[PDB]
Design a protein around this ligand. Structure first.
Ligand SMILES: Cc1cccc(Cl)c1NC(=O)c1cnc(Nc2cccc(C(=O)N[C@H]3CC[C@H](C(=O)O)CC3)c2)s1
Length: 271
């Protein structure tokens, strides 16, 4: 993890604030002063506890182990000066869930499937690097100006994205992340609809344990709905691996007529 000198960082705008720190958009001077890049900068405010420091610096330590197109890139940290900072690449379109809700209906099927392929490729890499995300959801994916989606937020757990064995037994593995990816597929194809709508957490658990699953999104390719349904097998060993998901999505994208067979969606009487 690269320690960045504070003279190389400038903050221009607040992105968001918390009771523990803020996130800024800024610039980072790199490469011996010959290069300047936009960055996101997260701070940890004075008075933080040892646990907070371990978690904050731990998120950057995890992020710095990875080098993949679909995983947010860490530029480095400021730990020797206060406030401490984590510095990442800047993703111009922010969080995927909010982005899709602000772009409802505006992308093609192929674009949405390509976003899911990118997220799956980042998750395949994390899983094979022996990392279980445990909080995979479209709110934790960021989107750049070129529509590339990257897994972030490597730092309670929303029930409605979590596989049943992780809810009950706290058995979190890459297969429970596959369940969560299935919910992200449904979020993407619905432009950010809230999984399970008004059901309470216990009602979501009730429905899932009775075998209910989220219904097809509108205008969703049958193959895409079949794949998200497989992600939601109750028996975790029956779920696809991320390697299978990436392979299937690639085959669909390469033969895009395969995406024209739509799953049935389901009163206005008129004619
Ligand atoms: C993911 C992560 C973990 C730990 C540390 C850090 Cl620094 C990160 N990185 C980040 O949080 C972010 C990387 N890129 C981000 N982009 C982002 C997220 C949410 C909203 C926006 C967004 O649209 N911000 C605008 C709001 C309006 C202004 C403008 O540019 O017109 C200023 C910036 C951008 S946040």
């Amino acid at each position: 993890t690269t320690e960045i000198h504070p003279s190389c960082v400038t903050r221009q705008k607040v992105i968001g604030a918390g009771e523990f720190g803020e996130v800024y958009k800024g610039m980072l001077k790199t490469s011996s002063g010959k290069k300047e890049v936009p960055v996101a900068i997260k701070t940890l405010k004075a008075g933080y506890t040892e646990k907070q420091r371990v978690d904050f610096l731990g998120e950057a330590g995890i992020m710095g182990q990875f080098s993949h197109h679909n995983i947010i890139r860490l530029e480095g940290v400021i730990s020797k000066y206060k406030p401490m900072m984590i510095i990442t690449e800047y993703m111009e379109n922010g969080a995927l869930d909010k982005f899709l809700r602000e772009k409802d209906g505006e992308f093609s099927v192929l674009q949405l499937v390509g976003m899911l392929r990118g997220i799956a490729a980042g998750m395949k890499y994390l899983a094979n690097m022996n990392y279980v995300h445990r909080d995979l959801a479209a709110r934790n994916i960021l989107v750049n100006s070129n529509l590339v989606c990257k897994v972030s937020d490597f730092g309670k757990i929303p029930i409605r994205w979590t596989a049943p064995e992780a809810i009950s037994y706290r058995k979190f593995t890459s297969a429970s992340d596959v369940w969560s990816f299935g919910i992200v597929m449904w979020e993407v194809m619905t432009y950010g609809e809230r999984p399970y709508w008004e059901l309470s957490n216990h009602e979501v658990m009730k429905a899932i344990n009775d075998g209910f699953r989220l219904p097809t999104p509108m205008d969703c390719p049958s193959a895409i709905y079949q794949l998200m349904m497989q992600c939601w097998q109750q028996e975790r060993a029956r779920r696809p691996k991320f390697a299978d998901i990436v392979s299937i999505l690639d085959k669909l994208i390469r033969a895009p007529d395969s995406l024209k067979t739509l799953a049935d969606f389901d009163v206005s009487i008129r004619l």
